[PDB]
Design an enzyme around this catalytic site. Structure first.
Site, PDB file in Angstrom:
ATOM      1  N   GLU A  35      -7.407   0.178  -3.162  1.00  0.00           N
ATOM      2  CA  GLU A  35      -6.176   0.288  -2.389  1.00  0.00           C
ATOM      3  C   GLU A  35      -6.486   0.505  -0.910  1.00  0.00           C
ATOM      4  O   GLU A  35      -5.887  -0.136  -0.046  1.00  0.00           O
ATOM      5  CB  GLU A  35      -5.314   1.455  -2.887  1.00  0.00           C
ATOM      6  CG  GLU A  35      -4.540   1.207  -4.175  1.00  0.00           C
ATOM      7  CD  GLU A  35      -3.404   0.214  -4.004  1.00  0.00           C
ATOM      8  OE1 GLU A  35      -2.992  -0.046  -2.852  1.00  0.00           O
ATOM      9  OE2 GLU A  35      -2.910  -0.294  -5.029  1.00  0.00           O
ATOM     10  N   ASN A  46       4.432  -4.149   5.496  1.00  0.00           N
ATOM     11  CA  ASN A  46       4.920  -5.132   4.531  1.00  0.00           C
ATOM     12  C   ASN A  46       6.099  -5.935   5.076  1.00  0.00           C
ATOM     13  O   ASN A  46       6.719  -5.552   6.067  1.00  0.00           O
ATOM     14  CB  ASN A  46       5.322  -4.439   3.230  1.00  0.00           C
ATOM     15  CG  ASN A  46       4.167  -3.705   2.585  1.00  0.00           C
ATOM     16  OD1 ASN A  46       4.108  -2.476   2.606  1.00  0.00           O
ATOM     17  ND2 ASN A  46       3.235  -4.459   2.019  1.00  0.00           N
ATOM     18  N   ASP A  48       9.063  -6.268   3.953  1.00  0.00           N
ATOM     19  CA  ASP A  48      10.348  -5.583   3.846  1.00  0.00           C
ATOM     20  C   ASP A  48      10.554  -4.462   4.856  1.00  0.00           C
ATOM     21  O   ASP A  48      11.530  -3.719   4.772  1.00  0.00           O
ATOM     22  CB  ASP A  48      10.538  -5.035   2.428  1.00  0.00           C
ATOM     23  CG  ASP A  48       9.589  -3.893   2.105  1.00  0.00           C
ATOM     24  OD1 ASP A  48       8.621  -3.683   2.862  1.00  0.00           O
ATOM     25  OD2 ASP A  48       9.812  -3.210   1.086  1.00  0.00           O
ATOM     26  N   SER A  50       8.607  -1.895   5.227  1.00  0.00           N
ATOM     27  CA  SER A  50       7.939  -0.674   4.790  1.00  0.00           C
ATOM     28  C   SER A  50       6.463  -0.707   5.148  1.00  0.00           C
ATOM     29  O   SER A  50       5.911  -1.756   5.475  1.00  0.00           O
ATOM     30  CB  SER A  50       8.077  -0.493   3.278  1.00  0.00           C
ATOM     31  OG  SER A  50       7.287  -1.439   2.573  1.00  0.00           O
ATOM     32  N   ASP A  52       2.533   1.057   3.893  1.00  0.00           N
ATOM     33  CA  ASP A  52       1.777   1.776   2.872  1.00  0.00           C
ATOM     34  C   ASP A  52       0.855   2.710   3.633  1.00  0.00           C
ATOM     35  O   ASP A  52       0.185   2.298   4.583  1.00  0.00           O
ATOM     36  CB  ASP A  52       0.976   0.808   2.005  1.00  0.00           C
ATOM     37  CG  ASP A  52       1.860  -0.201   1.299  1.00  0.00           C
ATOM     38  OD1 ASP A  52       2.891   0.208   0.722  1.00  0.00           O
ATOM     39  OD2 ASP A  52       1.519  -1.399   1.311  1.00  0.00           O
ATOM     40  N   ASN A  59       3.921   3.917  -0.476  1.00  0.00           N
ATOM     41  CA  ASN A  59       4.958   3.173   0.237  1.00  0.00           C
ATOM     42  C   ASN A  59       6.129   3.962   0.816  1.00  0.00           C
ATOM     43  O   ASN A  59       6.695   4.840   0.164  1.00  0.00           O
ATOM     44  CB  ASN A  59       5.464   2.065  -0.687  1.00  0.00           C
ATOM     45  CG  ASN A  59       6.309   1.047   0.033  1.00  0.00           C
ATOM     46  OD1 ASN A  59       7.532   1.146   0.054  1.00  0.00           O
ATOM     47  ND2 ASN A  59       5.658   0.066   0.639  1.00  0.00           N
ATOM     48  N   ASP A 101       6.783   8.645 -12.915  1.00  0.00           N
ATOM     49  CA  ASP A 101       8.027   7.902 -12.726  1.00  0.00           C
ATOM     50  C   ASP A 101       8.440   7.078 -13.943  1.00  0.00           C
ATOM     51  O   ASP A 101       9.633   6.944 -14.228  1.00  0.00           O
ATOM     52  CB  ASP A 101       7.913   6.984 -11.505  1.00  0.00           C
ATOM     53  CG  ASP A 101       9.241   6.363 -11.114  1.00  0.00           C
ATOM     54  OD1 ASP A 101      10.193   7.125 -10.837  1.00  0.00           O
ATOM     55  OD2 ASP A 101       9.334   5.117 -11.079  1.00  0.00           O
TER      56      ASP A 101
END
Length: 129
Positions: A35, A46, A48, A50, A52, A59, A101
């Site tokens: 990662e 990103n 959108d 956002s 990371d 995110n 989650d």
């Protein structure tokens, strides 16, 4: 700061990630490797809007707040800036919420593509834990 493989393994073990929600320590080290390449300062923008953040590339649309991401939910209730610390505490605490989650470690693309199904134990061999 860029963690060494074994140095990171020891830190993640200290923070209780070994077997957290059924995932052995090697899974976490492997995820961090692909990662961020063990880099606590890594950031990635990103499409959108956002970003990371940190060693586990958490995110900003769902987990942390950076104030510039539309549709932010900040489910970890923490500023994204806290995830860029040399101390991995904040990242580990948020990662624990993410994995609980409902989709396990699949939340980390790098983990599902490069770690899942492999001999993740290889990531902790040679280390003094």
């Amino acid at each position: 700061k860029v963690f060494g493989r074994c140095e990171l393994a020891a830190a993640m073990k200290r923070h209780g990630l070994d077997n957290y929600r059924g995932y052995s320590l090697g899974n976490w080290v492997c995820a961090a490797k692909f990662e961020s390449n063990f880099n606590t300062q890594a950031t990635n923008r990103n499409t959108d809007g956002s970003t990371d953040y940190g060693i586990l590339q958490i995110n900003s649309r769902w987990w942390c707040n950076d104030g510039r991401t539309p549709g932010s939910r900040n489910l970890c209730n923490i500023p994204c800036s806290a995830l860029l610390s040399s101390d991995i505490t904040a990242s580990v605490n948020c990662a624990k919420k993410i994995v609980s989650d409902g989709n396990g470690m699949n939340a980390w693309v790098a983990w599902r593509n490069r770690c899942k199904g492999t001999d993740v134990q290889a990531w902790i061999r040679g280390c003094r834990l």
